[PDB]
């Protein structure tokens, strides 16, 4: 088999994370998770997980990739072969994430194609998909729903009144999802990655458009009330466990933690490459992107609350369609709104596409690290690219149906951004800190970076990330409140069971692999554990 390649440049690693873990989890997910959990009170567990767990486990995952020169799963066969199920857990998480993430890009593409005509369809109440309750935004103050909300709910989503009624497959979103999957297949199976083009247009224009949205949102009237909602916290909201777990999994979501993606991108690093300053600068880039886009979108929501004469927490969707309400509403107040809509949904497509390329690459890299000499370079590996893309498309068709928004919120809360992320992050930190050793891994890091990680990273992998993950997990279990879509829908018991099935299929890769390896090896159980804890 051919040897595993390294990056062609120092900036090829940096541009693969900066498009990889700086994506829709910043401009789309952090806004509605902040919105749904009260705005101000979301930021305290956000920053607690960001410093205690986010950047530490992000650098930990990249530096695990750099040490082992392996991606996702087989990186754990040189650290602790007993806990190799962290890799399979990461692969399950990244597969479910690939499915619903590409569904987000399908919604963005449908908004992009619906932006091509000269009048934006979410701007006025004259269309077939609206209701008699439709009042224009300016006419609200002079049970009324805005045109952006009914556009999102009744043209894009075509929202059935339950998950029990899937309705019919929306061929608009189905063809949009197929187009984005053909784009993802053409950027992996060709292996282009736009190496001569991602230096400027990919790297800057999403952030330039985010700055444009910042300037637009701060100039809307009533943006100060929205920023007050965004920043000023409710301490009584922190007593509820959803704020803590939602912020922690948003941190573990934005950073591509528990996915194998950052191990895979770190696996292409050179051995004697200082990843620490790159990891810190790019983590600051990711968290700053989320926090800046939060300022923009919550200034827009404060304007929307001012214009419609309703409270800030009730003006838009407390669910996964906030970036498709507030941001299009802000687009409808830019000069020449059609062109700015085209640029915005090209922004969301660029961010989500760069992410989806990077985590599809991480999933493929993990699954070819499992089997060398089978998916070598082509004529068998290229078929498996199309197989992964086709199965993830067919699983993504369940979020295209008229009740597929509920399936999306199920996947988003449970499949790849919930207790599964806390589970795998706790197991990564526990393995590295105690079964490998903070001092042994620090010796490895000094051997290859140049210096040992400080008392921040060492004590974060040792104590802080395990206590945060264990506390948030048991705090969500002992004060359990079930999943609700847009604060009004109550999910049925089979839907909560399906979400827990996705989460546990992410979780149960670790105990299944532990039991499988403790059953395969011969000897007494203490000898079996002591053999499987030794790295290979």
């Amino acid at each position, epitope marked *: 088999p051919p040897q595993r390649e390294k990056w062609s440049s120092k900036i090829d690693f940096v541009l693969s994370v900066a498009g990889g873990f700086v994506g829709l989890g910043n401009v789309w997910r952090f806004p509605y998770l902040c919105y749904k959990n009260g705005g101000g009170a979301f930021l305290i567990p956000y920053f607690i997980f960001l410093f205690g767990s986010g950047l530490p486990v992000f650098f930990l995952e990249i530096i695990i990739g750099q040490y082992t020169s392996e991606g996702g799963i087989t990186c754990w066969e040189k650290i602790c072969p007993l806990f190799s199920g962290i890799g399979y857990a990461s692969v399950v998480i990244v597969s479910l994430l690939n499915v619903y993430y590409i569904v987000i890009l399908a919604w963005a593409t449908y908004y992009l194609f619906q932006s091509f005509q000269k009048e934006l369809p979410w701007a006025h109440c004259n269309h077939s998909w609206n209701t008699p309750h439709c009042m224009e935004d300016t006419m609200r103050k002079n049970n009324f729903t805005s045109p952006v909300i009914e556009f999102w709910e009744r043209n894009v989503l075509s929202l059935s009144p339950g998950i029990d009624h899937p309705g019919s497959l929306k061929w608009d979103l189905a063809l949009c999802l197929l187009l984005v999957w053909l784009v993802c297949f053409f950027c992996i199976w060709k292996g282009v990655r736009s190496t001569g083009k991602v230096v400027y247009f990919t790297a800057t224009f999403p952030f330039a458009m985010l700055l444009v949205l910042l300037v637009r949102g701060l100039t809307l009237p009533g943006a100060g009330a929205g920023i007050k909602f965004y920043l000023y916290p409710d301490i009584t909201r922190l007593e509820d466990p959803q704020v803590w777990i939602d912020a922690g999994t948003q941190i573990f979501f934005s950073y591509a933690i528990c996915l194998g993606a950052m191990t895979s991108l770190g696996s292409y690093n050179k051995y004697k490459y200082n990843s620490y300053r790159d990891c810190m600068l790019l983590g600051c880039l990711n968290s700053g992107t989320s926090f800046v886009s939060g300022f923009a979108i919550f200034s827009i929501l404060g304007f929307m609350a001012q214009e419609q004469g309703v409270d800030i927490a009730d003006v838009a969707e407390s669910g996964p369609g906030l970036a498709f309400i507030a941001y299009p509403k802000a687009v409808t107040m830019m000069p020449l709104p059609t062109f700015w809509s085209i640029l915005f949904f090209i922004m969301l497509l660029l961010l989500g596409l760069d992410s989806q390329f990077v985590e599809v690459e991480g999933q493929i890299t993990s699954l070819v690290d499992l089997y060398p000499s089978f998916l070598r370079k082509g004529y068998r590996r290229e078929i498996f690219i199309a197989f992964v893309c086709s199965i993830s498309y067919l699983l993504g068709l369940t979020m295209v149906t008229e009740g597929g928004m509920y399936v999306f919120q199920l996947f988003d809360y449970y499949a790849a951004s919930g207790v599964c992320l806390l589970w795998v992050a706790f197991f990564e930190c526990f393995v590295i800190a105690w079964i490998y050793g903070v*001092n042994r891994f620090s010796e490895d890091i*000094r*051997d290859m970076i140049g210096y040992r990680p400080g008392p921040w990273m060492k004590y974060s992998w040792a104590v802080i990330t395990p206590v945060l993950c264990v506390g948030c997990f048991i705090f969500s279990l002992v004060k359990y409140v079930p999943l609700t879509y847009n604060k009004t829908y109550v999910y049925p018991n089979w839907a909560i069971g399906l979400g827990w099935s996705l989460a546990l299929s992410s979780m149960l890769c670790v105990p299944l692999v532990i039991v499988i390896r403790l059953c395969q090896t011969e000897g007494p159980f203490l000898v079996r554990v002591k053999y499987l804890l030794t790295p290979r």
Partner: antibody
Framework: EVQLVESGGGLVKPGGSLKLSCAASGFTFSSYAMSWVRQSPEKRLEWVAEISSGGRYIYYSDTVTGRFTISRDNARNILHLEMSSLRSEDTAMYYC????????????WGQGTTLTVS | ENVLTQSPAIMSTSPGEKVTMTCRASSSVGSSYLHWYQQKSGASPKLWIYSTSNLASGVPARFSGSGSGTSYSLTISSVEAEDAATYYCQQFSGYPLTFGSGTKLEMK
């Protein structure tokens, strides 16, 4: 007060052996990689051998690449250097240098041990 | 090996005069890995400038370092009588670590 005290300085025959002993004090010896750096009578410094924090990464220069052995004793906070097949062009003045951060270098050195081969 | 060809050892300058000494590397040092050591007469070397720009503890502000990649330089703004020593550059990047040759600074 970080203090490195080297021991084992003396004359050996050609083809002989010697075992130096950098006895460190005032700091946690387990958390810093240690390097042996020798100084020729022409005052040309040459790095000899580096051992990592826990002793799993061991590096040698090409002049001692197959006949020098460097070890630690983290319980006693002492560093070693085992020599074999000591030739004539190995007479030097041996320092142990606390080189742990590669971007900070050999920040703390110690005393010396004159190794003489004749 | 990464042979660090340094400035010639025999240099003699008056006190209070700005001096410099260069350090040419055969390979490319990463400019955060090349350090400078001051060894006095009959004493052990000590770290003087690390990562070719920063000043170690106990090093006066009159010392400075510059350069990157191949050429690296140590510069004294005003040489005193206590600056009479031998200075070695040292890349601390490649696993066969190499010190530079001597550059002996003596008075007049």
């Amino acid at each position: 007060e970080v203090q490195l005290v080297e021991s084992g300085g003396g004359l050996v025959k050609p083809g002989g052996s010697l075992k130096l002993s950098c006895a460190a004090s005032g700091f946690t010896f387990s958390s810093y990689a240690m390097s042996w750096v020798r100084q020729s009578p022409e005052k040309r410094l040459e790095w000899v051998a580096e051992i990592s924090s826990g002793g799993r990464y061991i590096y040698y220069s090409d002049t001692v690449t197959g006949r020098f052995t460097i070890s630690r004793d983290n319980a006693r906070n002492i560093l070693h250097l085992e020599m074999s097949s000591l030739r004539s062009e190995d007479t030097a003045m041996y320092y142990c240098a606390r080189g742990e951060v590669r971007q900070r270098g050999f920040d703390y050195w110690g005393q010396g041990t004159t190794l003489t081969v004749s | 090996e990464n042979v660090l060809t340094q400035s010639p050892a025999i240099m003699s300058t008056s006190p209070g005069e700005k001096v410099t000494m260069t350090c040419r590397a055969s390979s490319s040092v990463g400019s955060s890995y090349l350090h400078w050591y001051q060894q006095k007469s009959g004493a052990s070397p000590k770290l003087w400038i690390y990562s070719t720009s920063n000043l170690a503890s106990g090093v006066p502000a009159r010392f400075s370092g510059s350069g990157s990649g191949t050429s690296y330089s140590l510069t004294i703004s005003s040489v005193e009588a206590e600056d009479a020593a031998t200075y070695y550059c040292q890349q601390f990047s490649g696993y066969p670590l190499t010190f530079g040759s001597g550059t002996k600074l003596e008075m007049k």
